[PDB]
Design a protein around this ligand. Structure first.
Ligand code: VVX
Length: 856
């Protein structure tokens, strides 16, 4: 009864019926669901018995400042009482001292000598799924740090251990003996559609990641037909013994008089290490020839897709499996060590610290033992020079790898590239990744979920790792779910992504229900946005807003749109929907602006979400995640550029949520220079500054001009490094604190060479409204240079991250040309003295371009 309800609920939540998985009758799919159900149910059982503090670390992981004395006012209360107390504490005090102080006031008011010790409690942030615990001082917590900048007072609740336990309780659930050349039979093509004035060619390649194992073989030219017949042998120049484990056979069917039609790839060995034999029907994917990186599973739409039949020949009378790790380590155990001169050792040091020539690859390979012992972080370059088309060479390389020491997270993220398709090399990358903290993992999760699209099989090390970490952290679980869920309309990933979400759901029944409440809210938002789109092409904005409001006031709407966790942040609770405050934006897609309030949270419960359907939001999220990382990298070096890292989350097909930043308007709106306002100006250059002055009276203007200066320097650098163009007054926002930030991200990474942009209006604010202010202007250039030089020292981080994102399917992130842009913007080739001089030329060039509006 409950088993059937859970399954149908999973089916609705994931957006694919579980019955569809069974109907494939695929043993690989059937082993994944059994082995991952068990693995996720064990994680669940482990969780239902965690300690109470241990339960907070799962459900409410700490939100700490990248870094993690002074008077501070905090307001504390208890769960079963409306009565609060306001204490004067210090930012250097640990939450525990606040707790002991909170109980002291309760001891007098209630006159009893309180049995409770501070240790017995946790401090909940008012009307939020956020907690303050652990031995970190108050300023170290993101909520107190945010509170300290906005002047506003922290509002906390005392939560007893027994109450947290009550929450845990209610949330309960031999190959090497076959030297003949690898060949195949190309039998026939089916349902192909092309010009009859042309001929059909079949191109095949044997790959190990991005590298060829041998040269490509083309079929004979056959006349264009819907059912073309070949019945021909395609011999490759590689022996069946030399075929690596991660060898993938790639096909590109096309038309010639080069006209791309379709493509298809398959792994030569199955998920049980067996070399494949017998007839194979490859349901081809459409082109725009040979695509190594493309998925190794067939096209689901079997009725429309082209279906090339091939025939893997019987290389032996019995089945053939890839030799086990014991046979590999035995063959690779044999060889000669690196005995070379100081001169070749000096050249080896020069190339390993530094793309290399053939002879330079020959020295990396001969000196592989010196690489293992004296250059372990050079592992990726050694894996690159290895000949993956020679069984002896792979075995030597694998033998070194099993004895290879663990590498930093930085080196491990590089090893996840499609360049390293070897499962033992990938298992190795995951072993060096396990030391990632939850915060580091959250930072790179977007890229790790993309790496899943490179994976040759369902049951892989990266899936178990992502699953295990997601079941031990509710925030990780949340974002993993939404990154998978959002790509369910993509037929190439839907089976993989649907299977991972089903596994997770088996491990968190309670969270499956929480996320369905989010899914139901997004369901109603799409129907409401659809209404608005139709209504805005028929009536006036006041009329459409009122009708949107009437629709929202319905029982079904009021209930679905209310009392939920935010998909943008599970800490944020969207309680009561303020219908009167809701509206829509006037852009093509008519985005909805949805407001919420919460009495339990006060001012902190006054939140909003923007719902946008019709436009792709994956590039906006990636841009924002990159900027957020910059802010993290800067803060770690003690540079706080006053950034606004707001939420952006794609949820479905051209659908997603953007976080509302209140007390912010666009440069364009402020610059309208409307009459009967506190910001009305004598000169349009005054407007932004008058607005700033109106919002920040007295001594407050100085801090606002400084928030402006700091954020501006950060965004000038962020948009320059990331090449974010189409920047105008309508997509630049200013907060009432003076903080500047960017919205609506179309183009990024040139698509060319977007220059460093300095705008006179912002230079006018930095210079405090004065024509000349070298003091303030050069303090600004210093912030810019400092920011730029910090990013450069983390150049490989961005490069390793952007390389993993190539799997994403973003048209503006599809080749080496895009990654080159980063290398160029960060002047990754030059020394810091050289890069700084290059940055100062582009900065001065940008000031000279800003001086066009200064002159006029
Ligand atoms: C409801 C009314 C009283 N408002 C409407 C909004 N404007 C300001 C405004 C105009 N555009 C945005 C905005 C726009 C977007 C946005 C919109 C479209 C694509 C995007 N990609 C990344 C951000 C983004 C996100 C935002 N978060 N917080 C504010 C925004 O805010 C103030 C008055």
């Amino acid at each position: 009864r409950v088993k059937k309800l859970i399954n149908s609920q999973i089916s609705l939540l994931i957006g694919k019926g579980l019955h569809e998985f069974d109907s494939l009758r695929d043993p690989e799919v059937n082993d994944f669901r059994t082995k991952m159900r068990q693995f996720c149910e064990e994680a669940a059982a482990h969780r239902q018995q965690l300690g109470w503090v241990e339960w907070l670390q799962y459900s409410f992981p700490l939100q700490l400042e990248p870094s993690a004395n002074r008077a501070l006012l905090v307001n504390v209360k208890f769960e079963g009482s409306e009565e609060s107390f306001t204490f004067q504490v210090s930012t250097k005090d640990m939450p525990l001292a606040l707790m002991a102080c909170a109980l002291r006031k309760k001891a007098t008011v209630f006159r009893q000598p309180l049995v409770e010790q501070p240790e017995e409690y946790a401090l909940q942030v008012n009307g939020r799924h956020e907690y303050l615990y652990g031995n970190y001082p108050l300023c170290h917590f993101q909520y107190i740090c945010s509170c300290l900048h906005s002047g506003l007072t922290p509002h906390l609740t005392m939560v007893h251990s027994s109450s947290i336990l009550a929450m845990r309780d209610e949330q309960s659930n031999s190959l090497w003996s076959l030297e003949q050349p690898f060949s195949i039979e190309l039998i026939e093509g089916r349902k192909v559609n092309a010009d009859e004035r042309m001929k059909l060619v079949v191109q095949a390649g044997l790959f190990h990641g991005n590298e060829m194992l041998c040269k490509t073989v083309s079929s004979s030219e056959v006349n264009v037909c819907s059912e073309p017949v070949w019945k021909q042998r395609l011999e490759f120049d590689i022996s069946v013994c030399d075929l690596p484990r991660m060898a993938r056979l790639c096909f590109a069917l096309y038309a010639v008089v080069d006209c791309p039609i379709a493509w298809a790839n398959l792994m030569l060995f199955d998920y049980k290490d067996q070399l494949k034999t017998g007839e194979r029907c490859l349901y081809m994917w459409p082109s725009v020839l040979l695509n190594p990186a493309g998925t190794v599973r067939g096209n689901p739409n079997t009725e429309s897709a082209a279906a090339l039949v091939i025939y893997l020949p019987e290389v032996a009378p019995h089945p053939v499996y890839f030799p086990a790790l014991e046979k590999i380590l035995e063959l690779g155990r044999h060889g000669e060590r690196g005995r070379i001169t100081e001169e070749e050792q000096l050249q080896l040091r020069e190339i390993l610290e530094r793309e290399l020539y053939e002879h330079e690859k020959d020295l990396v390979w001969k000196m592989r033992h010196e690489v293992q012992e004296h250059f372990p972080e050079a592992l990726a370059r050694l894996l690159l020079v290895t000949k993956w088309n020679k069984h002896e060479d792979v075995a030597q390389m694998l033998y070194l790898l099993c004895s290879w020491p663990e590498l930093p997270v930085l080196s491990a993220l590089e090893l996840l590239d499609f360049s390293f398709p070897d499962c033992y090399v990938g298992s190795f990358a995951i072993k060096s990744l396990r030391k990632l903290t939850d915060d580091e993992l959250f930072q790179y999760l977007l890229q790790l979920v993309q790496v899943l699209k490179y994976e040759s099989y369902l049951d892989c090390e990266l899936t178990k790792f992502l699953l295990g970490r997601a079941l031990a952290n509710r925030k990780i679980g949340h974002f993993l779910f939404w990154h998978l869920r959002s790509e369910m309309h993509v037929p190439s990933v839907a089976l993989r992504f649907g299977l991972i979400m089903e596994a997770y759901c088996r491990g968190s029944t309670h969270h499956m229900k929480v996320l369905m409440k989010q899914g139901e809210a997004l369901s109603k938002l799409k129907a409401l946005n659809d209404f608005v789109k139709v209504s805005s092409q028929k009536t006036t904005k006041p009329q459409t807003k009122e009708m949107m409001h009437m629709c929202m006031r319905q029982e079904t709407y009021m209930e679905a749109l209310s009392h939920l966790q935010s998909p943008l942040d599970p800490s944020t609770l969207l309680e009561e929907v303020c219908v009167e405050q809701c509206t829509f934006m006037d852009s093509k897609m008519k985005p909805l602006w949805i407001m919420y309030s919460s009495e339990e949270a006060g001012s902190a419960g006054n939140v909003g979400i923007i719902f946008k359907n019709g436009d792709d939001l994956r590039q906006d999220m990636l841009t924002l995640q990159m900027i957020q990382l910059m802010d993290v990298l800067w803060k770690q070096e003690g540079l706080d550029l006053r950034m606004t890292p707001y939420g952006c989350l794609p949820t479905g097909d051209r659908t997603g949520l953007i976080e509302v930043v209140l007390h912010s308007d666009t440069i364009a709106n402020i610059q309208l220079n409307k009459s009967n306002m506190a910001a009305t100006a004598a000169f349009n250059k005054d407007a932004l500054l008058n607005w700033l002055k109106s919002k920040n009276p007295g001594e407050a203007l100085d801090r606002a001009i400084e928030e402006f200066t700091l954020s501006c320097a950060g965004y000038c650098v962020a948009t320059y490094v990331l090449g974010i163009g189409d920047r105008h007054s309508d997509n630049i926002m200013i907060r009432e604190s003076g903080q500047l930030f960017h919205i609506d991200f179309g183009h990024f990474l040139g698509n060319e060479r977007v220059p460093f942009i300095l705008t006179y209006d912002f230079v006018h604010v930095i210079q405090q409204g004065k024509t000349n202010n070298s003091e303030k202007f050069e303090r600004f250039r210093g912030y810019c240079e400092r920011a730029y030089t910090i990013l450069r020292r983390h150049g490989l981080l961005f490069l390793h991250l952007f390389a993993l994102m190539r799997a994403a399917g973003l048209p503006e992130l599809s080749c080496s040309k895009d990654i080159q842009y980063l290398k160029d913007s960060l002047a990754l080739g030059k020394t810091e003295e050289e890069a700084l001089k290059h940055f100062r030329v582009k900065f001065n060039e940008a000031l000279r371009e800003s001086w066009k509006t200064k002159v006029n």
